[PDB]
Amino acid sequence: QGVDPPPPPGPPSFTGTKLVNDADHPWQPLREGDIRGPCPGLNTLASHGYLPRDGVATPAQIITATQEGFNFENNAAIVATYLGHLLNGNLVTDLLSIGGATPKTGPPPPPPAHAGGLNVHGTFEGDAGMTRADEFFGDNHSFNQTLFDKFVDFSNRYGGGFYNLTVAGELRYSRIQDSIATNPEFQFKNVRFITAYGETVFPINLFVDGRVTTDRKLSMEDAASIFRDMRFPDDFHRSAVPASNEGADQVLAAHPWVPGGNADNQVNNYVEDPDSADFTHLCRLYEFVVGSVQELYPNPTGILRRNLIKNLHYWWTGVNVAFGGCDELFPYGQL
Numbered sequence: 088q089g090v091d092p093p094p095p096p097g098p099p100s101f102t103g104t105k106l107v108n109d110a111d112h113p114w115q116p117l118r119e120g121d122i123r124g125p126c127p128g129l130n131t132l133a134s135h136g137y138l139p140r141d142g143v144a145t146p147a148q149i150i151t152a153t154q155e156g157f158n159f160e161n162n163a164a165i166v167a168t169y170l171g172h173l174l175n176g177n178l179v180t181d182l183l184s185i186g187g188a189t190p191k192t193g194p195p196p197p198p199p200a201h202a203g204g205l206n207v208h209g210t211f212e213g214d215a216g217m218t219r220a221d222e223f224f225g226d227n228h229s230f231n232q233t234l235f236d237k238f239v240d241f242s243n244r245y246g247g248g249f250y251n252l253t254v255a256g257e258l259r260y261s262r263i264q265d266s267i268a269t270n271p272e273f274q275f276k277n278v279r280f281i282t283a284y285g286e287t288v289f290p291i292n293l294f295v296d297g298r299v300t301t302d303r304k305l306s307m308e309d310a311a312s313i314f315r316d317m318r319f320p321d322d323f324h325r326s327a328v329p330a331s332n333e334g335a336d337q338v339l340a341a342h343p344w345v346p347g348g349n350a351d352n353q354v355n356n357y358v359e360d361p362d363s364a365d366f367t368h369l370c371r372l373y374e375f376v377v378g379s380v381q382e383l384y385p386n387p388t389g390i391l392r393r394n395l396i397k398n399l400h401y402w403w404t405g406v407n408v409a410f411g412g413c414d415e416l417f418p419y420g421q422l
């Protein structure tokens with residue numbers, strides 16, 4: 088009949104480096120029914136058993152796994168997790184697929200809500216990723232070797248054969264240009280505009296071994312291991328401090344860019360969207376997503392309403408800090 092969802096975990100008691108690829112968290116191959124998706128972080132945590140190996144988890148499990156496995160900073164974890172859960176999870180069973188649809192999330196919600204997982208395109212998952220292709224081309228979730236070859240090429244050209252912040256700036260812009268030129272449905276606004284800059288520094292801040300204190304750069308071997316194989320590097324130690332999107336501002340500054348998309352189902356036709364969230368208007372992202380949730384859940388009652396109210400509040404607790412203060416919205420009132 089349903090779960091009563093607990094508030095998110097706080098930061099871990101211990102926030103230093105440690106071995107995370109350890110005997111208790113072995114890489115294992117996929118079994119029948121195991122779900123993986125567009126996030127290499129969550130994929131790796133699932134494939135090492137930091138998350139349930141089937142790739143379906145509670146918000147609380149995701150937050151603790153990202154903290155334990157990578158030292159993802161607590162508020163960043165809260166912002167990402169409840170965004171994903173509100174839009175793509177089952178609020179009654181409190182389960183989120185890190186990939187596509189699965190009976191493992193339990194009885195479906197009332198449409199147009201779907202609990203279809205992180206693979207669902209258009210409000211969270213979006214275009215111009217590093218190792219995943221745009222949904223327009225037919226597969227937004229699988230590793231794409233051609234795109235990884237470009238990652239390697241840009242690492243050779245700008246990072247001495249490694250991925251570093253200079254490479255991130257160049258690759259992000261070039262990937263936007265690829266999508267402008269080839270994807271007539273290309274969108275780069277609202278949630279995606281914000282998440283696309285953070286995702287380009289996560290490999291530097293979180294995939295580079297935490298024992299490396301200076302000149303942080305990711306080898307192509309380690310990159311392939313995580314992005315393709317969902318496997319921690321041998322002897323991997325997590326970041327020595329909680330971390331998330333440090334340096335994302337510099338990635339944007341290297342090639343200033345404005346939220347928008349290709350208009351009128353045509354390539355090379357990018358039009359700015361002045362109403363979109365951007366990095367000096369972050370609260371628009373909060374308002375936009377609350378609106379999206381109302382479209383998914385036009386008139387909830389009972390346990391569904393209760394769990395929506397709670398999850399919206401949990402998300403706001405992270406957003407309020409991460410975005411430097413946003414007025415909380417109450418689309419369904421209070422408990």
Ligand SMILES: *[C@@H]1O[C@H](CO)[C@@H](O[C@@H]2O[C@H](CO)[C@@H](O[C@@H]3O[C@H](CO[C@H]4O[C@H](CO[C@H]5O[C@H](CO)[C@@H](O)[C@H](O)[C@@H]5O)[C@@H](O)[C@H](O[C@H]5O[C@H](CO)[C@@H](O)[C@H](O)[C@@H]5O)[C@@H]4O)[C@@H](O)[C@H](O[C@H]4O[C@H](CO)[C@@H](O)[C@H](O)[C@@H]4O)[C@@H]3O)[C@H](O)[C@H]2NC(C)=O)[C@H](O)[C@H]1NC(C)=O
Binds near residue numbers: 253302
């Ligand atoms: C991601 O990874 C990449 C790749 O690893 C990494 O790139 C390195 O980035 C750093 C900067 O962040 C680079 O280091 C800097 O290089 C600057 C450019 O150097 C060129 O020009 C120099 C200046 O020349 C003057 O004099 C000549 C006359 O001889 C004249 O023609 C010019 O017009 C000019 O006036 C020159 O010195 C330099 O050449 C030397 O070094 C090369 C070897 O690279 C050698 O072949 C030459 O014979 C010569 O010894 C080169 O041609 C440079 O200006 C800059 O200098 C500043 O800092 C140093 C010390 O910090 C001070 O001494 C100096 O006063 C300056 O203030 C600095 O050295 C580095 O070269 C990149 N490496 C590679 C391989 O690309 C990114 O940083 C990474 N990103 C992150 C975020 O980590």
Ligand SMILES: *[C@@H]1O[C@H](CO)[C@@H](O[C@@H]2O[C@H](CO)[C@@H](O[C@@H]3O[C@H](CO[C@H]4O[C@H](CO)[C@@H](O)[C@H](O)[C@@H]4O)[C@@H](O)[C@H](O[C@H]4O[C@H](CO)[C@@H](O)[C@H](O)[C@@H]4O)[C@@H]3O)[C@H](O)[C@H]2NC(C)=O)[C@H](O)[C@H]1NC(C)=O
Binds near residue numbers: 230269271352353354
């Ligand atoms: C892995 O990921 C890669 C990279 O995203 C996918 O490859 C891309 O696939 C798409 C779809 O086939 C390609 O898009 C098409 O590109 C044509 C132009 O290509 C040239 O120009 C680019 C640079 O701008 C070069 O990189 C490329 O090598 C070519 O020289 C366009 O003409 C096409 O447009 C036509 O169709 C659209 C859609 O209907 C219309 O809007 C247009 O008006 C037009 O008629 C189209 O956009 C894209 O070029 C591919 N990129 C690369 C680098 O290969 C893989 O499919 C994917 N595969 C898997 C399974 O891993």
Ligand code: HEM
Binds near residue numbers: 149167216217218289
């Ligand atoms: C906390 C919960 C998390 C959620 C809900 C989440 C969700 C997502 C989603 C939906 C994408 C696809 C983005 C898109 O196509 O637009 C993505 C990409 C990504 N995530 Fe996660 N993520 C989380 C945590 C993490 C962590 C901890 C890391 C790093 C350790 C990470 C690293 C990445 C990277 C690098 C990408 C880009 C992949 C690519 O472009 O090739 N994420 N994530």
Ligand SMILES: CCCCCCCCCCCCCC(=O)O
Binds near residue numbers: 166282285332410
């Ligand atoms: C891929 C996981 C992250 C997705 C969720 C990120 C949404 C907001 C990112 C941070 C934007 C600025 C906030 C900050 O700097 O603290």
Ligand SMILES: [Mg+2]
Binds near residue numbers: 214215221
């Ligand atoms: Mg994507």
